[PDB]
Amino acid sequence: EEFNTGPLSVLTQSVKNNTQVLINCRNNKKLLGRVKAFDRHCNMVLENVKEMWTEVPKSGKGKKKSKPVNKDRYISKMFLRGDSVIVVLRNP
Amino acid sequence: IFIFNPRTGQLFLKIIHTSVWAGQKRLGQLAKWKTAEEVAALIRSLPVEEQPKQIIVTRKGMLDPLEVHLLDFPNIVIKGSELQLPFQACLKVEKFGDLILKATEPQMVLFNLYDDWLKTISSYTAFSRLILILRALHVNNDRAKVILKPDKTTITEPHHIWPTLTDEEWIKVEVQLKDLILADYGKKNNVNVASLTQSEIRDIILGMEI
Amino acid sequence: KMLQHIDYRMRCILQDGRIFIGTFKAFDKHMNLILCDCDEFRKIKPKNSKQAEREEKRVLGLVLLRGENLVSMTVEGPPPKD
Amino acid sequence: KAHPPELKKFMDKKLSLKLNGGRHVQGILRGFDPFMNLVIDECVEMATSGQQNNIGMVVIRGNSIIMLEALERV
Amino acid sequence: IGVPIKVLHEAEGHIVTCETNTGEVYRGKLIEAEDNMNCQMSNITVTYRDGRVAQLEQVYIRGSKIRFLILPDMLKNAPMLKS
Amino acid sequence: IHPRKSYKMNSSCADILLFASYKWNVSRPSLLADSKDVMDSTTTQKYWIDIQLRWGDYDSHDIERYARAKFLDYTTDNMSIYPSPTGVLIAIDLAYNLHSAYGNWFPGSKPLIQQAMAKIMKANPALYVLRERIRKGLQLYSSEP
Amino acid sequence: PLNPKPFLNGLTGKPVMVKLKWGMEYKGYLVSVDGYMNMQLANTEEYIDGALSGHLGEVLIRCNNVLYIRGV
Amino acid sequence: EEPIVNRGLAAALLLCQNKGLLKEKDGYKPDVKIEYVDETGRKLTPKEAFRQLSHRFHGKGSGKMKTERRMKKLDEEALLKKMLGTVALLQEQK
Amino acid sequence: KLVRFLMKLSHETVTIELKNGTQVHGTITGVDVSMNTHLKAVKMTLKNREPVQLETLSIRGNNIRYFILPDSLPLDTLLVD
Amino acid sequence: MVQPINLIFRYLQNRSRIQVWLYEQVNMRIEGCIIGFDEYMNLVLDDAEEIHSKTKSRKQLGRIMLKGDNITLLQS
Amino acid sequence: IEMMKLMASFDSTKGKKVDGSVNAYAINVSQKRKYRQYMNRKGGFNRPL
């Protein structure tokens, strides 16, 4: 009933179609991947996620001079605990 | 054969000897299928973790022999390119050039065209830096060579290719090679410099036609 | 699975990095901890160091740790006789 | 089942609250809830800049309250 | 109300210390200790993250902002070894 | 299902049996496309579904006439035992990749069998293997994108 | 004269901008609000520190991270 | 060229889009999904979905050697997609 | 409730990244309803430190950022009720 | 013997102006007049304005609603 | 009194079941296709269940 009209309709309309969602997490790692499931807490079990975050080389010169680099890692199947979710976003 | 990985910078440049086609008695009916079979033999040489699944041919007359010679690998994608990349600029640099010409045996010389820029910046902007270097060295050889050393004090190591510069020197030499590229283009392409947006600057360094 | 760890010499990590080791005697539904014999660590914790294995250390004795600040557990040695 | 915090010892007393972000506040207590939100008369703000800022009746969320010190003798 | 909150119930009127969420530690003698670990304590020294020492004769610290509570080992023996 | 029932052309059986846990109101036998359907005032609990495959030639590849004819042949036959008089018979033409059903419909069953037949002609793996077996027998291929 | 869930009742469908505690801002037509006040926004554009970094589409914004809601 | 900006999500979308990683009836929409999967949850090719169907149909699956090749193929995909340049840089020792 | 999916996952070698960045690679032994994760054969790398081998660990369930499950997991028969 | 909800009760009986201060964002303050609230202590506020104290900036907001577990104080 | 007309006494739904669509969970599973056996069964002709 109201499972499909609330604000979690972004998640239950993305787990039906198995489309990918972009999640800005709390430590500013970005999870791109398909929701296999979610719940009240947005404990989203996800398949095939690109986890994309930013680094700097952290003063490799000794003079604190470098530019941030985009790093990413692949995770096959994850269980993202949903407190660390800030925003979930369906794709355009 | 220049087999350039954008992501890992591992350039597999295969030396093709003069004796392969000085006395071959053949047409291009050997040539297309021969460069295709040798790049396929490179694919068969490497393990499955290092084999690609997407192969981009610069010259459009090679994807049709690559379809034939890579039916042992249906998992790979052979697309053409609208942007052509000047890897004859690799021939113009003296190291690869006399490496190729002095090589009496056909071989599978490896290189890493990003020297160690993967510990500093991305692989995308390292690719854009490499194609700035290669296109600017294609539009003028020794002018871009003397731009490539902003001082005559800097040196490259014998295991490197390009001179060891850090971020400030690299950004200044990048804008120097960039307006060198656009100055040579606007000298040749009848139109000025300041009428082009950065999408058009992007596909002029990349090799597309507007 | 924690009743299989009672009275042990437990190494409890907090969310600041202030590590405890002591007598895992009582826990709660929020994992509020009661630890006797417990001492605290910040910087170096022992795997047989080249200099000394236990500095940055303080005596506290018996603590009630709130479960809000608690992360992990590990037993380091068997329980003593007393 | 939320029992009220046991603060009739501290009613009508001059207390210095510590608040969350290293903050501080002073005033007379006037009441509470089970959530320990405190209502304060004669509230002087007392920031870390050093100059003391009177307000009056304020309400403080109990989440942000670290400690009470009864400056007056209870 | 489990066994640690019963332990701090059995620490009422005893010498107790609380390290707080910001890092201040408070060594005194308790007066009231509730279900939600709120502690009204007395004769107490406050030690900030500055390292300085202060004293005042009473304090009331909120329970969730407690990091931990140094208890005396008067309570280490009796009677909670049956736990 | 009997092992020779897939090509048991003369007679039939049932393939799926739906039990309601209630009594469905069901309709008169109408085609899969008959969007306006009238309610048959019987109420049923078990609802059979038959899958009749066929290989239509040029004369007789009307899958709607075939589904209607096979339904009203097999429900009024002696040599074809159905659990209920109420149920649906989905006919699928493999030579022309057509599909239609004719039998009775409970609520929601008509859009479900409509969309399920659509996805089952688009995506069935045995149909896919039949299709590419025909394509390799005819030596007819599509241009790769 | 107007309590919070009547307020969010009043603005389901108008363009608003909800501000996170972490300084982010989100402009768009919000769709719906639950009991916890998680928010579903459609047609969103994300304003980092008063300057937008992108049009994004449909976003779920979790209730533990909103700072306020602003009707624009 | 786009950094995943701290305090920002939309740059990650502009990154992943750049990288290309993207009777009185009831009255309702029955979203029929017809999906073929193996036991691991992988979405199944229609040739090998028919192969699973036909193994279950004939009652006789593959032999030992073809199962060795198929299983080693699936962990070749698993080992490939879970990921010598640094070894090349270290050898370039000369 | 999705935590019920995790307590069906007994005896799996999963890694767990926490809110302190500490990656814990080990065979999971028990889950509470509050995701209180009890692990064995633990290889715990607290981040900005070298990894430590420990025989048993028990993470509080609040402090889990995410899990990482292996390739060989049948979740289509695990998330059913 | 008054309560916090007695103060905010009397305060939206006043409709005067108040300034909410936040959890741990000590420079960030928000001024407004409450129109309504209930028991989760989310507050709608009249013509609110963010004042940044260390630069003394008044960014106008309008009809706002602020979330309950963020406030540290409401000063009249 | 208007504190009762507000509909007083600050609430905190911890443990208590929430009102509406907050509880929305949704699981996308699809099991392996259990087909039946036809060839070389040793069993009697109709299908097993």
From Swiss-Prot, chain C:
Domain Sm span(s) in chain numbering: 1-79
Post-translational events: Methylated by PRMT5.
Subcellular location per the Swiss-Prot or TrEMBL entry: Cytoplasm, Cytosol; Nucleus
Coiled coil ranges: none
Effect caused by changing residue 48 to S: In CCMS; expression of the protein is reduced
Assembly mode: Core component of the spliceosomal U1, U2, U4 and U5 small nuclear ribonucleoproteins (snRNPs), the building blocks of the spliceosome. Most spliceosomal snRNPs contain a common set of Sm proteins, SNRPB, SNRPD1, SNRPD2, SNRPD3, SNRPE, SNRPF and SNRPG that assemble in a heptameric protein ring on the Sm site of the small nuclear RNA to form the core snRNP. Component of the U1 snRNP. The U1 snRNP is composed of the U1 snRNA and the 7 core Sm proteins SNRPB, SNRPD1, SNRPD2, SNRPD3, SNRPE, SNRPF and SNRPG, and at least three U1 snRNP-specific proteins SNRNP70/U1-70K, SNRPA/U1-A and SNRPC/U1-C.
Disorder this protein is connected to according to its UniProt record: Cerebrocostomandibular syndrome: A syndrome characterized by severe micrognathia, rib defects ranging from a few dorsal rib segments to complete absence of ossification, and intellectual disability.
Recorded family membership: Belongs to the snRNP SmB/SmN family.
Extra remark beyond the main annotation: Patients with the autoimmune disease systemic lupus erythematosus (SLE) have autoantibodies directed against some of the individual snRNP polypeptides. The most common autoantigen is called Sm. B/b' bear Sm epitopes.
This protein's name: Small nuclear ribonucleoprotein-associated proteins B and B'
Parent sequence residues shown: 8 to 89 of 240
Swiss-Prot record, chain E:
Keywords, alphabetical: Acetylation, Cytoplasm, Methylation, mRNA processing, mRNA splicing, Nucleus, Repeat, Ribonucleoprotein, RNA-binding, Spliceosome
Top-rank taxon, per record: Eukaryota
Post-translational modification: Methylated on arginine residues by PRMT5 and PRMT7; probable asymmetric dimethylation which is required for assembly and biogenesis of snRNPs.
Sm domain boundaries: 3-75
GO molecular function term, any single one: telomerase RNA binding
Subcellular location as annotated: Cytoplasm, Cytosol; Nucleus
GO CC terms of this entry: catalytic step 2 spliceosome; commitment complex; cytosol; methylosome; nuclear body; nucleoplasm; nucleus; pICln-Sm protein complex
Keyword flag Signal: no
GO biological process, one term: spliceosomal snRNP assembly
Principal subcellular localisation of the protein: cytoplasm
Biological role: Plays a role in pre-mRNA splicing as a core component of the spliceosomal U1, U2, U4 and U5 small nuclear ribonucleoproteins (snRNPs), the building blocks of the spliceosome. Component of both the pre-catalytic spliceosome B complex and activated spliceosome C complexes. As a component of the minor spliceosome, involved in the splicing of U12-type introns in pre-mRNAs. As part of the U7 snRNP it is involved in histone pre-mRNA 3'-end processing.
Family: Belongs to the snRNP core protein family.
More details: In the autoimmune disease systemic lupus erythematosus, antinuclear antibodies are developed with Sm specificity.
Protein known as: Small nuclear ribonucleoprotein Sm D3
Organism: Homo sapiens
Lineage: Eukaryota, Metazoa, Chordata, Craniata, Vertebrata
Range covered out of full length: 3 to 85 of 126
Swiss-Prot record, chain F:
Protein name: Pre-mRNA-processing-splicing factor 8
Superkingdom of origin organism: Eukaryota
Record's subunit section: Part of the U5 snRNP complex. Component of the U4/U6-U5 tri-snRNP complex composed of the U4, U6 and U5 snRNAs and at least PRPF3, PRPF4, PRPF6, PRPF8, PRPF31, SNRNP200, TXNL4A, SNRNP40, DDX23, CD2BP2, PPIH, SNU13, EFTUD2, SART1 and USP39. Component of the U5.U4atac/U6atac snRNP complexes in U12-dependent spliceosomes. Within the minor spliceosome, which acts on U12-type introns, interacts with PPIL2 and RBM48. Core component of U2-type precatalytic, catalytic and postcatalytic spliceosomal complexes. Found in a mRNA splicing-dependent exon junction complex (EJC) with SRRM1.
Disorder association: Retinitis pigmentosa 13: A retinal dystrophy belonging to the group of pigmentary retinopathies. Retinitis pigmentosa is characterized by retinal pigment deposits visible on fundus examination and primary loss of rod photoreceptor cells followed by secondary loss of cone photoreceptors. Patients typically have night vision blindness and loss of midperipheral visual field. As their condition progresses, they lose their far peripheral visual field and eventually central vision as well.
Stretch list, region Restriction endonuclease homology domain: 1-139
Species this protein is from: Homo sapiens (Human)
Upper taxonomic lineage: Eukaryota, Metazoa, Chordata, Craniata, Vertebrata
Compartments in which it is found: Nucleus; Nucleus speckle
Region of the whole protein represented: 1614 to 1758 of 2335
UniProtKB/Swiss-Prot annotation, chain J:
GO molecular function list: RNA binding
Domain Sm: residue ranges: 5-76
GO cellular component: catalytic step 2 spliceosome; cytosol; methylosome; nucleoplasm; nucleus; pICln-Sm protein complex; precatalytic spliceosome; small nuclear ribonucleoprotein complex
Keyword hit for Cytoplasm: yes
Alphabetical UniProt keywords: Cytoplasm, Disease variant, Hypotrichosis, mRNA processing, mRNA splicing, Nucleus, Ribonucleoprotein, RNA-binding, Spliceosome
Main localization category: cytoplasm
Protein origin, superkingdom: Eukaryota
One BP term from GO: spliceosomal snRNP assembly
Coiled coil: none
Subcellular location: Cytoplasm, Cytosol; Nucleus
Keyword Nucleus: yes
Tissue: Widely expressed. In scalp skin, it is present in the hair follicle, the epidermis, and the dermis.
Miscellaneous comment as given in the Swiss-Prot or TrEMBL entry: Patients with systemic lupus erythematosus produce antibodies which interact with snRNP proteins.
Subunit note: Core component of the spliceosomal U1, U2, U4 and U5 small nuclear ribonucleoproteins (snRNPs), the building blocks of the spliceosome. Most spliceosomal snRNPs contain a common set of Sm proteins, SNRPB, SNRPD1, SNRPD2, SNRPD3, SNRPE, SNRPF and SNRPG that assemble in a heptameric protein ring on the Sm site of the small nuclear RNA to form the core snRNP. Component of the U1 snRNP. The U1 snRNP is composed of the U1 snRNA and the 7 core Sm proteins SNRPB, SNRPD1, SNRPD2, SNRPD3, SNRPE, SNRPF and SNRPG, and at least three U1 snRNP-specific proteins SNRNP70/U1-70K, SNRPA/U1-A and SNRPC/U1-C.
Record family assignment: Belongs to the snRNP Sm proteins family.
Source organism per UniProt: Homo sapiens (Human)
